[model samples]
Target: LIVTQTMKGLDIQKVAGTWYSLAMAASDISLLDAQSAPLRVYVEELKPTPEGDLEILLQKWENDECAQKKIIAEKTKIPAVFKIDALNENKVLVLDTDYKKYLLFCMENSAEPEQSLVCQCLVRTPEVDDEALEKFDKALKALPMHIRLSFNPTQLEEQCHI
Candidate 1:
């Protein structure tokens, strides 16, 4: 008999917050394009489940208005535990207990350091952006083994008008 187990170590609670999408990557060249709103963002609110897992509420926004809302996925701390496989100055790749990997592109709200176009890889599919993907690949090539994660949004909820 074979016994199989799964695990993940990513703490969603640590990543809970609003994040903007600056760029996207794709394997196809034609898919390289910016968002219609130019500035896309999402807010992730996390809650602890009674079963000891983490529930995530993901809200996607465009032009400061809510465009989509859904339950992204639930993560468990048991089994193998999810861990950060690799990361650079602008991106992070996580390995899940199920042996699947996810790549997230870090986006900044500031334009001073040059504009960025970011995207989130929900799954391994044909939905990635081509040009942005190339940029990410190039960056990772020259990026150091250890990179610092930073999120600097120009505005926050306290600074926004209700």
Candidate 2:
């Protein structure tokens, strides 16, 4: 099995805040090109629950309108690994983060017949960070999957009001 190196001893509380979708890479280009695409997700917040779980608030654009989706991620034994209840056969991991500046996430989904992988680069501000981008680039290249699409989402703040 192939996997990216996840963050160690991650502080859940520090990860709770607003995040903009700076960039993304997926195995299929079609999964990210459309506005309503599944991979075009903007993270609004990551609220930690009392049960050591994470309540993720994600924003999606549908028909030019912002819609917030909530999901619960059950904490695994590892600090940065989680099993999302909303997504079957999926595991979300925090590959890297500064807590204050950037976050790199890798999701492995097997809901479909074939597995799909998506890597998302999120930042506190709209501006891109060179260090974070380099980390994201290296992580994606190390993955077993072939990236078919790599692009930065534009007007992220304007599209997601929530």
Candidate 3:
């Protein structure tokens, strides 16, 4: 059976803070094609809530401007799994993270025609790390969904100030 699992002993506090959308792959290629794609969000900060939920501060490029968004990811029974009721992001899983280096996560979107899974690689800096990319590659291979599209890392670190 094909199973996607979350990280073990995931320290939410260590994983919090600035992150860039370094790379991504989607079950639906169109989902990662454009600058404003649903899965192409830059993570600015991840704050833990008093309710044991996660407060995700995100940013995206829209019409040549950086737009801000916030979502409260309700915690699930599983430590690394969360329910995010925003846009097409229904379910979220923290696949892997090394605290200060990179974060690999997957999102299950159940909107429209059918359900789609999108995996993202978020990094502490604009440049991609070899170790992080290896972990992400392993994740992609393990997922049941076929990767239709892969995106290059955005240079938002150089472009956007806020």
Candidate 4:
């Protein structure tokens, strides 16, 4: 449980918007280096399942494929955290966000910040601000090694065309 600290004041309802993915990287450098087409994620619609879990329909492109990935992220909530339906009980850490402009997320291993498995940076719009980008880079760099720090500069208007 590395993410002892999480962003407070995160209302799931308020977070429901078209969040665009600006960058991604993980412990595996090769996987990220081989990535194609920029990834864009739309939070779109959300619902509550019969089991009281939060059901969310997310759309995003996964590398080399033009079709967006539609995944039902059925998550459960704890104080200040969302436990992503993880096989290993892993949680998605909300690092920083105003829930309007920028949202940063990471899943770390154990109690270390540098041992993050993956990091995703999202923006309210397709274009991320320069200051935001700098902060994003710094966040990625904070990880242990082999960090993927950039993405093809494309607007979500073009990348997320339906």
Q: Per-candidate TM vs. native?
A: 0.32, 0.84, 0.82, 0.66
Tens-digit per-residue lDDT, 27-139, candidate 1? 22322332322323333444545554444444434465655544333332442222221111121233221113223433322322123323332322223344534444454
Clashing pairs in 4: none
Question: Taking the tens digit of each residue's C-alpha lDDT, what string does model 2 give over 1-162?
Answer: 346488988988889878876777776666666777766677778889978999988888767788778988899889888888564347888988989999988777745512467778888887757787888888878665444433344565565532
Model 3, stretches more than 4 Å misplaced? 1-3, 110-114, 144-156, 159-162
Candidate 4 per-residue lDDT over residues 1-162, each given as its tens digit:
543446766566666646666666676564345334232244434454555444555554564554444444444555345555432325566677776777777655444334446676777776756666766677656455465655444544554433
C-alpha RMSD in Å of predicted model 4 compared with the true structure? 4.6
Q: Where is model 1 more than 4 Å wrong at Cα? A: 1-8, 11-41, 61-65, 76-152, 155-162
RMSD of each: 13.9, 2.9, 3.3, 4.6
Q: Rate residue 109 of model 4 by lDDT.
A: 49
Q: Which candidate number would show the highest TM-score if scored against the true structure?
A: 2
Model 4 has a clash total of: 0
Show where candidate 4 strays beyond 4 Å.
Answer: 36-64, 74-77, 86-89, 108-116, 152-155, 160-162
Q: Which stretches of candidate 2 lie over 4 Å from their true place?
A: 110-114, 144-154, 160-162
Please give the distance, in angstroms, between residue 16's alpha carbon in candidate 4 and its true position after superposition. 0.7
Sorted on lDDT, highest at the top, how do the candidates line up? 2, 3, 4, 1
- lDDT tens digits, residues 48-149, model 3? 876788899887776778788788889988888888878665888898887888898888864531246777788887675788888888888866554443
lDDT of 4 at 104: 74
lDDT of each: 0.32, 0.74, 0.72, 0.56
